Write a protein that binds this ligand. Structure first.
Ligand SMILES: [Mg+2]
Ligand SMILES: [Mg+2]
Ligand SMILES: [Mg+2]
Ligand SMILES: [Mg+2]
Ligand SMILES: [Mg+2]
Ligand SMILES: [Mg+2]
Ligand SMILES: [Mg+2]
Ligand SMILES: [Mg+2]
Ligand SMILES: [Mg+2]
Ligand SMILES: [Mg+2]
Ligand SMILES: [Mg+2]
Ligand SMILES: [Mg+2]
Ligand SMILES: [Mg+2]
Ligand SMILES: [Mg+2]
Ligand SMILES: [Mg+2]
Ligand SMILES: [Mg+2]
Ligand SMILES: [Mg+2]
Ligand SMILES: [Mg+2]
Ligand SMILES: [Mg+2]
Ligand SMILES: [Mg+2]
Ligand SMILES: [Mg+2]
Ligand SMILES: [Mg+2]
Ligand SMILES: [Mg+2]
Ligand SMILES: [Mg+2]
Ligand SMILES: [Mg+2]
Ligand SMILES: [Mg+2]
Ligand SMILES: [Mg+2]
Ligand SMILES: [Mg+2]
Ligand SMILES: [Mg+2]
Ligand SMILES: [Mg+2]
Ligand SMILES: [Mg+2]
Ligand SMILES: [Mg+2]
Ligand SMILES: [Mg+2]
Ligand SMILES: [Mg+2]
Ligand SMILES: [Mg+2]
Ligand SMILES: [Mg+2]
Ligand SMILES: [Mg+2]
Ligand SMILES: [Mg+2]
Ligand SMILES: [Mg+2]
Ligand SMILES: [Mg+2]
Ligand SMILES: [Mg+2]
Ligand SMILES: [Mg+2]
Ligand SMILES: [Mg+2]
Ligand SMILES: [Mg+2]
Ligand SMILES: [Mg+2]
Ligand SMILES: [Mg+2]
Ligand SMILES: [Mg+2]
Ligand SMILES: [Mg+2]
Ligand SMILES: [Mg+2]
Ligand SMILES: [Mg+2]
Ligand SMILES: [Mg+2]
Ligand SMILES: [Mg+2]
Ligand SMILES: [Mg+2]
Ligand SMILES: [Mg+2]
Ligand SMILES: [Mg+2]
Ligand SMILES: [Mg+2]
Ligand SMILES: [Mg+2]
Ligand SMILES: [Mg+2]
Ligand SMILES: [Mg+2]
Ligand SMILES: [Mg+2]
Ligand SMILES: [Mg+2]
Ligand SMILES: [Mg+2]
Lengths: 134, 122
RNA sequence: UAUCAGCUUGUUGGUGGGGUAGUGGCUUACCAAGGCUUUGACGGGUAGCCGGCCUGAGAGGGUGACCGGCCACAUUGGGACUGAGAUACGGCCCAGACUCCUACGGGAGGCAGCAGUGGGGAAUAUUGCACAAUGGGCGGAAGCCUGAUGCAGCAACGCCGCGUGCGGGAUGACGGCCUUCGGGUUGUAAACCGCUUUCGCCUGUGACGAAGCGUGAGUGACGGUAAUGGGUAAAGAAGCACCGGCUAACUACGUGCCAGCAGCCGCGGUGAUACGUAGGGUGCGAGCGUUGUCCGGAUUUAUUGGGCGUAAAGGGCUCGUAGGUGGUUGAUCGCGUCGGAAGUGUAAUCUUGGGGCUUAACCCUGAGCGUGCUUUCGAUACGGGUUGACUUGAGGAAGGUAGGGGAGAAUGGAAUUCCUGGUGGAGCGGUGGAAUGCGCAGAUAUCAGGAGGAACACCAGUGGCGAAGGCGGUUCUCUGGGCCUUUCCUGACGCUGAGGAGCGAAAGCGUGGGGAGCGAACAGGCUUAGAUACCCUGGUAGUCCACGCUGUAAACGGUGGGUACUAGGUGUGGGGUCCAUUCCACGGGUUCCGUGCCGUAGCUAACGCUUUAAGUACCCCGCCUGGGGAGUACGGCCGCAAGGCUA
RNA sequence: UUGUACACACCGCCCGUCAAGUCAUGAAAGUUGGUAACACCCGAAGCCGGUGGCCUAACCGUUGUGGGGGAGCCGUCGAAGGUGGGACUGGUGAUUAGGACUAAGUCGUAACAAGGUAGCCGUACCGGAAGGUGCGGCUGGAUCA
RNA sequence: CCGUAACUUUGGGAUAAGGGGGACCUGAGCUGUCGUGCACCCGUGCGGUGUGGUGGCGGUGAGGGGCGCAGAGUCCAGGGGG
RNA sequence: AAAAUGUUUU
């Protein structure tokens, strides 16, 4: 059964980006919506939208529309899940990870909401290292 | 393996085989020559490699090679035995230190003298 | 360490007393029956622990010398005494083992204090000086004691520093070595010329450590030491390893698979850059090699950081216990998590900033580090706890439905064999060819009748079902699971699952039954050099049934289960639903679940896999760590045995 | 073109007995040690608990002593020793088993090609040895499509 | 009363082996049974029943103590293990 | 249709 819906989101995004799909969809959760929002604010996806259920009439659907540049070029070089259900990863304000030498962003869930490493370091707050999207 | 599998049963290293058990944690050991003889090497080589069955002071008896052209040690000759394998000789894992105790340095050495216990000549 | 699974009876708890500096089964009496343990008790093995040290990019791995902290011990075992304080090292008592004295009655002793001896060992020092300094004991004090300590001796054992010369010198001298006999090389090397004097040697001066101590006088073990002036002579001062590749550096002579070399690959069999020597060279240098040991390289136990289709590796399969793990969401707690504050993390080490030794090693000093822990105050995104919702995961109801799923019983036909009878007569059978064999005592063949056991042609594969092993005559009885469906119900009840349990082809085993055909063993015939085989004729267990046992297979898709996502194309099995003509069905669609083939992205060492993954991901389990030895030995468990399992 | 374990290239490679030697290891009547304990018997020192007729300067006396103490003695515990039966483990052992390596020994040719009977897996029996055969399974075989 | 091996057909081997205690005096409490008696069910006038009785008799006894060379003090009555 | 084998050079 489903164990890590965040990892499911990440793998859905990775597979869709690899297959050059314009949009991907998944069941909605608050943390998924937050990660999608910070992905959009960091420019890794074109946009995102939460849709009220009208096909299954059961639950909200989170849909990410991706962006490909000139000559069909990926805007996401990769995404990786860090804090797995089997083994969870927490980083302090001083030991915050760097992704792609600082080019990519680690997504960290801090006590002040979802914050990209750069943000956390500015606020000197750590938390659970969710992802390494770059 | 999963993280839970590693937690339940961790990694275990290899055994790290020992090479010279008879020395018993010593760089070299004293022994007495219980037998001095020659052995034919394994193929593809061919010779009359000079070896000795030695009763080392650890109580273990092993076969030691005698390096260098020249040889004086015989029955009940006290020798110093160091590590060192002779590849084309099955069962020989030790060598006899020339120039120490009864065994003496190779006579006509002029190069690599220290490895054969040959004093410098004026 | 499970090839140690049970341990404990003052043991676990209670009450009263006793005891002690003190709590306490510490002790005692009485009462109760606890306590510990597969998250590894009990037992075995090894070991003083740490600050640190070595290695490593780090994570780690190895280690516990000096120095510093704690512990334990002082000939072995036990015991108390004295005391503020006792494992009482240089105390006492008893016993044991030792050594010594003895007048034989009895006494004395304990270097794991410092130095030293014997011994063991590859291996580790002087039976030194001083209490001048610092520390300690006693004394009011002068002072006394201090093998603590400060020093010296010894050893290249480690680290660091310095020297063995510097400049000039072509005529590129001799001599070695090589040669193509031209020369090349050693080589600016030498000779020769001019310089310098660190260290060593000779001689002079000569401390600091003492702002101490002492009423004073006086007072430095180290010590004529360090430092330093003068003198001597370029002199008193260079070795070791290596030169086939990794690996910096090559030739000649000698040897001829000999002598020997080697870390691996390998070298030596007459042109050896690999053996031995020489010249030349290279790396290091008061060292250089070898051996031992550790870490690295080794991502070669992979948390960082690996894998399991065929390379070593998926349990034969499922059920299920502990455990691990958890769809959406409200509230709350603030354990994980995160952020401050305080305390602590001695010193030394280590990193780093300053300073001192002529520099360095080393030393002093400031800071950092001390990766944690405790206390306390905050934050609430996530994990978790508590609590309440939701239905999409999961299960259920109702209806629809496919099938060699299983068990039991009865029963159908063909064929084989045997039996009885009729007919008929010379062979039949069998092979590459034969023979053994059967047959005039009538076989083979042929027809009729009967008995019996076993397997179910066609349907039937490109298919169905089952967790796997597997499952095919028909009928009935009993029974398991799957699939679909719009409504319906419950509301995360899910997934996986160590150990454990069950199921598990065939062969095999036990008791009884049955026995047609087939057929290990066996007998004979052939083939053959032989034929313990292939082939042929016979033929017993077995194959069959009932009830058990065994528990293994190339038990294979050599691919664990669950879930989500990622081109298609094209067969086929099952359930729906839609359409037109029907008012059947042919047909097309569409949807859900199977089962094949082709094939993109992607992956793979390749072969190949590719929505039924070996792709992209998350959860849990099993397993691998070079080939043999070996799935073997020993032990234990299971079994009637064969053997299986663990290893 | 297909198969291959051959590449010294089928005059290839390669398997197992037997014979010889060497090394390590297992079994074994036994034999020889070691360690850790257990149950009893005895039990020193000692502390504690009793007792003390004997010995007692401080205390008190009715000044004949008493109090209190001490030697001694007894009891519990108790090191060591004794006795006994087990547990674990090292060496060794006539004899025996297989493993590894070495003649360039003997006997066959089992596998690798359809290896000349396709191979292999489990099991069973048989055989100097490889192996042979039965039963079920696999393709890591193939013929013919 | 404690404890007991190889092996095993799991029954055994086994009384394996190897240990401790025993008698005498005193004796706390615990019990078997009966008991005049208390109350009570009485179907009483039943040949009864359940509570309930200081006691008698018997059994058993923790602890304490005595004596001897010796406490299963005589008779009686396995030796054991390989 | 069965039809075996191929030491040690340097
Ligand atoms: Mg108490
Ligand atoms: Mg020790
Ligand atoms: Mg350690
Ligand atoms: Mg120390
Ligand atoms: Mg005292
Ligand atoms: Mg003392
Ligand atoms: Mg002391
Ligand atoms: Mg002493
Ligand atoms: Mg000493
Ligand atoms: Mg010695
Ligand atoms: Mg002083
Ligand atoms: Mg003074
Ligand atoms: Mg003195
Ligand atoms: Mg080179
Ligand atoms: Mg030559
Ligand atoms: Mg490593
Ligand atoms: Mg290494
Ligand atoms: Mg690997
Ligand atoms: Mg896998
Ligand atoms: Mg494999
Ligand atoms: Mg499987
Ligand atoms: Mg199994
Ligand atoms: Mg559970
Ligand atoms: Mg959750
Ligand atoms: Mg919430
Ligand atoms: Mg410092
Ligand atoms: Mg300086
Ligand atoms: Mg510190
Ligand atoms: Mg919660
Ligand atoms: Mg139904
Ligand atoms: Mg049946
Ligand atoms: Mg058919
Ligand atoms: Mg098929
Ligand atoms: Mg509801
Ligand atoms: Mg089982
Ligand atoms: Mg069967
Ligand atoms: Mg049978
Ligand atoms: Mg039978
Ligand atoms: Mg036959
Ligand atoms: Mg199968
Ligand atoms: Mg397997
Ligand atoms: Mg599984
Ligand atoms: Mg999977
Ligand atoms: Mg499909
Ligand atoms: Mg793979
Ligand atoms: Mg076995
Ligand atoms: Mg080859
Ligand atoms: Mg043995
Ligand atoms: Mg006693
Ligand atoms: Mg006393
Ligand atoms: Mg008195
Ligand atoms: Mg006593
Ligand atoms: Mg004792
Ligand atoms: Mg023997
Ligand atoms: Mg063959
Ligand atoms: Mg064959
Ligand atoms: Mg046969
Ligand atoms: Mg018995
Ligand atoms: Mg007895
Ligand atoms: Mg009594
Ligand atoms: Mg008696
Ligand atoms: Mg009697």
């Amino acid at each position: 059964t489903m164990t890590d819906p965040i990892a499911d989101m990440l793998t859905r995004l990775r597979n869709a980006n690899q297959a050059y799909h314009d949009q991907t969809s998944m069941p909605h959760s608050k943390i998924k919506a937050g990660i999608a929002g910070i992905l959009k604010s960091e420019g890794y996806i074109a946009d995102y939208k939460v849709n009220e259920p009208k096909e299954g009439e059961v639950g909200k659907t989170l849909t990410l529309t991706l962006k490909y540049g000139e000559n069909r070029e990926r805007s996401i070089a990769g995404v990786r899940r860090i804090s797995k259900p089997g083994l969870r990863v927490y980083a302090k304000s001083t030991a915050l990870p760097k992704v792609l030498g600082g080019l990519g962003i680690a997504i960290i869930s801090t006590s002040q909401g979802l914050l990209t490493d750069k943000q956390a370091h500015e606020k000197s707050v750590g938390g659970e290292v969710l992802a390494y999207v770059w | 393996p999963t993280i839970q599998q590693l937690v339940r049963k961790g990694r275990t290293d290899k055994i790290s085989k020992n090479k010279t058990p008879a020395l018993k944690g010593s760089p070299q050991r004293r022994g007495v020559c219980t037998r001095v003889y020659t052995t034919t090497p394994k193929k593809p080589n061919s010779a009359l490699r000079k070896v000795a069955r030695v009763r080392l002071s650890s109580g273990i008896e092993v076969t030691a090679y005698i390096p260098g052209v020249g040889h004086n040690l015989q029955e009940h000759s006290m020798v110093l035995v160091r590590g060192g394998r002779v590849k084309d000789l099955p069962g020989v894992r030790y060598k006899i230190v020339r120039g120490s105790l009864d065994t003496q340095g190779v006579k006509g050495r002029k190069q690599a003298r220290s490895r054969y216990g040959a004093k410098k000549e004026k």
